[model samples]
Target: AVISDFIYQGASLHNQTDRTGETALHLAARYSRSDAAKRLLEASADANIQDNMGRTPLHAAVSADAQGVFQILIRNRATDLDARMHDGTTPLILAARLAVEGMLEDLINSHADVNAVDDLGKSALHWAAAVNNVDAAVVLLKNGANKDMQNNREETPLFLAAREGSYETAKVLLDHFANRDITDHMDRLPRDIAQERMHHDIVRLLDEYNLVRSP
Candidate 1:
């Protein structure tokens, strides 16, 4: 109602940016104010306006878990589904990090690039594995995500699983035939990282995976 009052009073400041370059639409989406966001959109708010960090309303929606507002933005054709933030992180990447199953599905089904990497060269699969989000990883992999895609540090998803001591995730990756011998920029194997990080179960899993692969 406040938003409507603003419009009625000729205060349709939809395009006004804050110190961070965030328009009223960005704040509405970030705070899950679906009604306010819809009103702003109707008032010609720039759905694709970028903040100081290059994040659009879509990014803010994901960050805030505002699925209702997220759908609204998508329907409004928010400029780029694959738009990146200042760190080269896409909406898909953010969804994977949050491990929200529905969000990941929506983005992937919307044709977001499953293999798109961030500024650190980390893909959605990498974030999923980092958090041991089995369902997230499964969604990414089922959509043709590269299991062995290396990051800026040359660490693969399996490496992240090891670092985070995710046994089930490691098992899933191994079942998916992830390359075990892949090394990082430090030339350390997943097993080596697991051992160093004191992830005993993960280290054991990696060793078993190696044994299974050893001809």
Candidate 2:
């Protein structure tokens, strides 16, 4: 339906909110409806309108891999690119977690802090490595992410990758010089976690580096 024309004339429905203040553009962002989102924005939808969970359409677009809507939101100067959730998760962090190609580049190009940490002190790299998204990890490394930064739980990206049995991400982190000896709040090394989890590839991957096994 040609709702945009009517909404633009009436100038209310497009901006209408539910309990969360999510609007037409936000709904368009959910399923990656690039054209629908494009029309809504053209109708003057508030790109920065946040939902109750401290999210905007950008969060949904990033998480849903809506590259088209993502670029649109990024292009709109009114969009709060730094918008954060209660957990302090930004669109960049969501991009890293999802490992959507070029999404991180767009966020970085917008000058988002690559090292920005969430409420738990976990940066984008931490989530990327934990989820075994090596592409995101590599992009973060290239952009000066803190590879060894410890979260509140004392979990490094390497420790997270190891604990999660993410061998590929462990490989990438190790190649990028992630410290192997860093222990968590539990006082366990990443290698120890790898051993306990029977992550053979990760155990050998740790050993594959020039470092010797723990005595």
Best by TM-score: 1
lDDT of 2 by residue, 171-199 (tens): 89988878998999999999989999888
Predictions in order: lDDT: 0.85, 0.84
Q: If scored against the real structure, what TM-score would every candidate get? A: 0.88, 0.85
TM-score of 1: 0.88
Which sections of candidate 1 miss by over 4 Å?
1-17, 42-44, 210-215
What is residue 170's positional error in candidate 1, in angstroms? 1.7
How much is 212 displaced in model 2, in angstroms? 8.6
Candidate 1 C-alpha lDDT tens digits along 155-174? 99999999988888888898
Number of clashes found in candidate 1? 0
Candidate 2 wrong stretches, greater than 4 Å: 5-16, 31-44, 212-215
